[PDB]
Write a protein that binds this ligand. Structure first.
Ligand SMILES: O=[N+](O)c1ccc(-c2n[nH]c([C@@H]3O[C@H](CO)[C@@H](O)[C@H](O)[C@H]3O)n2)cc1
Ligand SMILES: O=c1[nH]cnc2c1ncn2[C@@H]1O[C@@H](COP(=O)(O)O)[C@@H](O)[C@H]1O
Ligand SMILES: *Cc1c(COP(=O)(O)O)cnc(C)c1O
Length: 809
C-alpha cells in the first residue's frame, strides 16, 4: 500500500507464504485447524528470521577477514522492545509480509501485537543503548553490544485501586525466536577467593566459579545487509557445584540468580551485593571474549583493534579487570598495561543526581573481588601522585579527587575510577557536558581538559518514525523521497512546504488518524472513553520527583478549579495523559501515581466538566506503548527542573512525530529549541543559573503559597481530603514534601508554567498555525538522529570511519 514499506513482488510473496506454512508444520508442529494467533505470530517470526541468517553469517565472516577495529558497547541495559516489525523495516520486507499474510487470511498488525517487549532496561539509558545498536549497524561499524540476559526484565505494572502493583515480566515463557544460544562459547567467571603474592606476581585463588553462557541476537542495519550481534550472558552453575545430594543440586540457584532479574532503579543507586555480582559478571565474560577475538588475527596494537565504551559506571570494573588480565595473566608491566587500558576505554556519564552515582563500600569489594580492590588502590595512588605534581600543596584537591572516599563507611567512587582510566569522558547533551566541567568533575577537567567531550543523544528514525508512524513517513517521502530515513538532516527540506496548503492538510490528517487509532486502543484494551478532538497533552517517562509529574498535576487541578469557578466559559478541551513506572521501593513515586489516579477519579466523573477535561493514567508504559502514544500526541511535557535531566530522549521522539513541546531549558530541550527556533517551542521556567541563585538565598516554598491564591487553594484541597474523601490525610506526605523539603522547586516554576500552558491553548484554537509550527519542529529534528550521535562517537572517540556502503545480499 505505502512506498516506504518496500515492494511486494509475486516471487517474494509466494516464497514467504511457502516458508510460513513450512514453519507452522515443521517448527511449531501445528496444523491450520488448531493454530492460534500466537502460532501464526511465531510462524511469521521464524520466516522473517530466516532472511537475517545469511546476512548475519556473512557480516561476521567479513569482519573476521577484513579485521576492522571492533567497538564493544558494554551496558547493563538494552531496552529492545519488539523485533518483528523492526526486522521487516530494516530488510525491506514489510509490504511483502503484509501481502503474504493477507493472502493466508491473516492480519499482520494483529500478529505483531502478540510479541512480548524485550524489556531489559528501565527507560532512557537502556533505550539509548538499543537506538545506538541500530545506528551502529546502519553505519557499517563492526560493533557488538554486550549485556546480561535477564530472565525477568522490567516488571509489568498493574494499577489496583489507584496504586501500582508489580508483576514479574516472564518475557521468555513462550520462547524468544530472535536469540541463538551459544553454549559452546561458555566462559568461567570468578568470585570471592583471596590473593597470594608469589615471586611470579599476584595470583587470585580459592575462587567460586560461575559460568557465563552467551545468547546472540541479530541487529540488522537499515537496508545495507549488515547484521551485527548483541551478545547477552546468562549465569549457569558448574556441574560439580556444591558436589546432601538433593540440596546441592537445588542450591545451584544461588549461582544462577546473577542473571535472574533487572534492578528496576532508574536514576538511583542501590548498593546491593547481587548488583555488584551482575556488574562483574558482564565485565569478566565480555573481556575474555574481547581478548579471544583479538588473539585470533603483542598488546601495543590492542587499542588500535579494540574500543570499549562504558555505558555509565555500571561496567566500570572493566578498567581494573583489563589491568588484572594484562598484569596478572599476560605479565605486562604496570605502566604498559595502563597505557593500553586508558587508550581502549571511554566513559559516558548519564546523570548528575548524587543519589544515582555508584559508590561501592570497600568491604563489599574486599570480600567479592579482592584482587580488583588492590588494583583500584594502586590506580588511586598513582593517579593522586600525578595530581600532587600538577597542583602541589593542594591537599583538599587530593581528598576531592581520590577514588577512595573517607567516612564511617569507606567507598570507591566509580565515576572517579572511570575518568582516571578512560581517554574520553562525555556527557549526553551540551548543557549536561558543561555542568560536568563546571561542577562535579571540575577538578578532573582542570587536570586533563582534553578528555572531556559532549555527544548529544539521539533516537533511531527507523523505530521512532517509519515503524511507529508510517502515515507521517509516507507524506514526507511523497515530497522529499526516502533518503531521509538514513540521513535525517534531509527533513530540513520540509521548511519549503510550511506554506503549502496540501502539506499542512496532510500533516494534520495524519495526526488526527493517529489520535483516532489511539482513542480506539484505549476503549478496546482498557474500557476508557476519550474525546479525540481534544488536545492530547502527554507526559510519559519514569515516575521521579526530578521529572515533576507533580507540577503537571498542579496544572491539571488549576484547570479543574477554573472550570468549576466559571463553568459556562469556553476552554480548549484537553485529554491529559500521564504514564510511567515507579521503582518498587520509591515511596514518593508510588504516592504520585496514586495522586494522579485520584485526580482522575474526581475530574472524569464531574458532570460540569463534561468532556472538556479528562485525566488518564496510562498503565504499563513501555517501548511498545510509546510506539502507540507518541504518534498520537499534540503536546509533549518535558518539565524537569533545570539541571536535572541529563538529556532526555522521549523529548526527541515527540518532536519527530508532530507534537509541540512545553519544557524547561534542561538537557537536550535546549538544543531542540535552538534547532527549531525558540519561537516554535513553549519554553518556561527557571534556567540553571536561576536555580543556583535560589539555592544561594534558600528555597522557601511558603513564599509561593502565600503569594499565589490559586496555588494555596490546591494545597488546601490536597490537605483537607478533597481528592481522597475516605482517607482525608492520604496525601499529607506529598503536601509536607512540597511545603518543606522539595529539592526540585515545584512551586517556583508554577506561575510561569500555567501562563505558558495558556499560550499552548491559544495556539491550539488556530489549527493552521498550530500545524505550521509542527512542520517547523519536524523539519529541524534531524540533529536528533542517533546516526548523527554515533558518527560523532566513531570519529571523535573510537577512531573509526562510518560507512553507508551495502554488503552484498
Ligand atoms: O542503577 N540503575 O538501574 C540505573 C542508574 C542510572 C540510570 C540513569 N542515569 N541516567 C539515566 C538517563 O540516561 C538517559 C540517556 O543518556 C538520559 O536521556 C536521561 O536524561 C538520564 O536520566 N539513567 C539508569 C539505571
Ligand atoms: O578459524 C577460523 N576459520 C574461519 N573462520 C573463522 C575462524 N575463526 C572465526 N571465524 C569467523 O568469525 C566467527 C565469528 O564469531 P566470533 O568468533 O564470535 O567473532 C565465525 O562465525 C567465522 O565466520
Ligand atoms: C524513550 C523512552 C524513555 C525515556 O523517556 P524520557 O522522557 O527521556 O525519560 C523511557 N521509557 C521508554 C519506554 C522509552 O521509549
Amino acid at each position: 500500500q505505502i512506498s516506504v514499506r518496500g515492494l511486494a513482488g509475486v516471487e517474494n510473496v509466494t516464497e514467504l507464504k511457502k516458508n510460513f506454512n513450512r514453519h507452522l508444520h515443521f517448527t511449531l508442529v501445528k496444523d491450520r485447524n488448531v493454530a492460534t494467533p500466537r502460532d501464526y505470530y511465531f510462524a511469521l517470526a521464524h520466516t522473517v528470521r530466516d532472511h537475517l541468517v545469511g546476512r548475519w553469517i556473512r557480516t561476521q565472516q567479513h569482519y573476521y577477514e577484513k579485521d576492522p577495529k571492533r567497538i564493544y558497547y558494554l551496558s547493563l541495559e538494552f531496552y529492545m522492545g519488539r523485533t518483528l516489525q523492526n526486522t521487516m523495516v530494516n530488510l525491506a520486507l514489510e509490504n511483502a509480509c503484509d501481502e503474504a499474510t493477507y493472502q493466508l487470511g491473516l492480519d499482520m498488525e494483529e500478529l505483531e501485537e502478540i510479541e512480548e517487549d524485550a524489556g531489559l532496561g528501565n527507560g532512557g539509558l537502556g533505550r539509548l543503548a538499543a537506538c545506538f545498536l541500530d545506528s551502529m549497524a546502519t553505519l557499517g561499524l563492526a560493533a557488538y553490544g554486550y549485556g546480561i540476559r535477564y530472565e525477568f526484565g522490567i516488571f509489568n505494572q498493574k494499577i489496583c485501586g489507584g496504586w501500582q502493583m508489580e508483576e514479574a515480566d516472564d518475557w521468555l515463557r513462550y520462547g524468544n525466536p530472535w536469540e541463538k544460544a551459544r553454549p559452546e562459547f561458555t566462559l568461567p567467571v570468578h568470585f570471592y577467593g583471596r590473593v597470594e603474592h608469589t615471586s611470579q606476581g599476584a595470583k587470585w585463588v580459592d575462587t567460586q566459579v560461575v559460568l557465563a553462557m552467551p545468547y546472540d541476537t541479530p541487529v540488522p542495519g537499515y537496508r545495507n545487509n549488515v547484521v551485527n550481534t548483541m551478545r547477552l550472558w546468562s549465569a549457569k552453575a558448574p556441574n560439580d557445584f556444591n558436589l546432601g545430594y538433593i540440596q546441592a543440586v537445588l542450591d545451584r540457584n544461588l549461582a544462577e540468580n546473577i542473571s535472574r532479574v533487572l534492578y528496576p532503579n532508574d536514576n538511583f543507586f542501590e548498593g546491593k551485593e547481587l548488583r555488584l555480582k551482575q556488574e562483574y559478571f558482564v565485565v569478566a565474560a565480555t573481556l575474555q571474549d574481547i581478548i579471544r577475538r583479538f588473539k585470533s588475527s603483542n598488546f601495543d596494537a590492542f587499542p588500535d583493534k579494540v574500543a570499549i565504551q562504558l555505558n555509565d559506571t555500571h561496567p566500570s570494573l572493566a578498567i581494573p579487570e583489563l589491568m588484572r588480565v594484562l598484569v596478572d595473566l599476560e605479565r605486562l608491566d604496570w605502566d604498559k598495561a595502563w597505557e593500553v587500558t586508558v587508550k581502549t576505554c571511554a566513559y559516558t556519564n548519564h546523570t548528575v543526581l548524587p543519589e544515582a552515582l555508584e559508590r561501592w563500600p570497600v568491604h563489599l569489594l574486599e570480600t567479592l573481588l579482592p584482587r580488583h580492590l588492590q588494583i583500584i588502590y594502586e590506580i588511586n595512588q598513582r593517579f593522586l601522585n600525578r595530581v600532587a605534581a600538577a597542583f602541589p600543596g593542594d591537599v583538599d584537591r587530593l581528598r576531592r579527587m581520590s577514588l577512595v572516599e573517607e567516612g564511617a563507611v569507606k567507598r570507591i567512587n566509580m565515576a572517579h575510577l572511570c575518568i582516571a582510566g578512560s581517554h574520553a569522558v562525555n556527557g549526553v547533551a551540551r548543557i549536561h557536558s558543561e555542568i560536568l566541567k563546571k561542577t562535579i568533575f571540575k577538578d578532573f577537567y582542570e587536570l586533563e581538559p582534553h578528555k572531556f567531550q559532549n555527544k548529544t543523544n539521539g533516537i533511531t528514525p527507523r523505530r521512532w518514525l517509519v515503524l511507529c508512524n508510517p502515515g507521517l513517513a509516507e507524506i514526507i517521502a511523497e515530497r522529499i523521497g526516502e533518503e531521509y530515513i538514513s540521513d535525517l538532516d534531509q527533513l530540513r527540506k520540509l521548511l519549503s512546504y510550511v506554506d503549502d496548503e496540501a502539506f499542512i492538510r496532510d500533516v494534520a490528517k495524519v495526526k488526527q488518524e493517529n489520535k483516532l487509532k489511539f482513542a480506539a486502543y484505549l476503549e478496546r484494551e482498557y474500557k476508557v472513553h476519550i474525546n479525540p478532538n481534544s488536545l492530547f497533552d502527554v507526559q510519559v517517562k519514569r515516575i521521579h520527583e526530578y521529572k515533576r509529574q507533580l507540577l503537571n498535576c498542579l496544572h491539571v487541578i488549576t484547570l479543574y478549579n477554573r472550570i468549576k469557578k466559571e463553568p459556562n466559559k469556553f476552554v480548549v478541551p484537553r485529554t491529559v495523559m500521564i504514564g510511567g513506572k515507579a521503582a518498587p521501593g520509591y515511596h514518593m513515586a508510588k504516592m504520585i501515581i496514586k495522586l494522579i489516579t485520584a485526580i482522575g477519579d474526581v475530574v472524569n466523573h464531574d458532570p460540569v466538566v463534561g468532556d472538556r477535561l479528562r485525566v488518564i493514567f496510562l498503565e504499563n508504559y513501555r517501548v511498545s506503548l510509546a510506539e502507540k502514544v507518541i504518534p498520537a500526541a499534540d503536546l509533549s511535557e518535558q518539565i524537569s527542573t533545570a539541571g536535572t535531566e541529563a538529556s532526555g530522549t522521549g523529548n526527541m521522539k515527540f518532536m519527530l512525530n508532530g507534537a509541540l513541546t512545553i519544557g524547561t531549558m534542561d538537557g537536550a530541550n535546549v538544543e531542540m529549541a535552538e534547532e527549531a527556533g525558540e519561537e516554535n517551542f513553549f519554553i518556561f521556567g527557571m534556567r540553571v543559573e536561576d536555580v543556583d541563585r535560589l539555592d544561594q538565598r534558600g528555597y522557601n516554598a511558603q513564599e509561593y503559597y502565600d503569594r499565589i491564591p490559586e496555588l494555596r487553594q490546591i494545597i488546601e484541597q490536597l490537605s483537607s481530603g478533597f481528592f481522597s474523601p475516605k482517607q482525608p490525610d492520604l496525601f499529607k506526605d506529598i503536601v509536607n514534601m512540597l511545603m518543606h523539603h522539595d529539592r526540585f522547586k515545584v512551586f517556583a516554576d508554577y506561575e510561569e508554567y500555567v501562563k505558558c500552558q495558556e499560550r499552548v491553548s491559544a495556539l491550539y484554537k488556530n489549527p493552521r498555525e498550530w500545524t505550521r509550527m509542527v512542520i517547523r519542529n519536524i523539519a529541524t529534528s534531524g540533529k536528533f538522529s542517533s546516526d548523527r550521535t554515533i558518527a560523532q562517537y566513531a570519529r571523535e572517540i573510537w577512531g573509526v570511519e562510518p560507512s553507508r556502503q551495502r554488503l552484498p545480499a
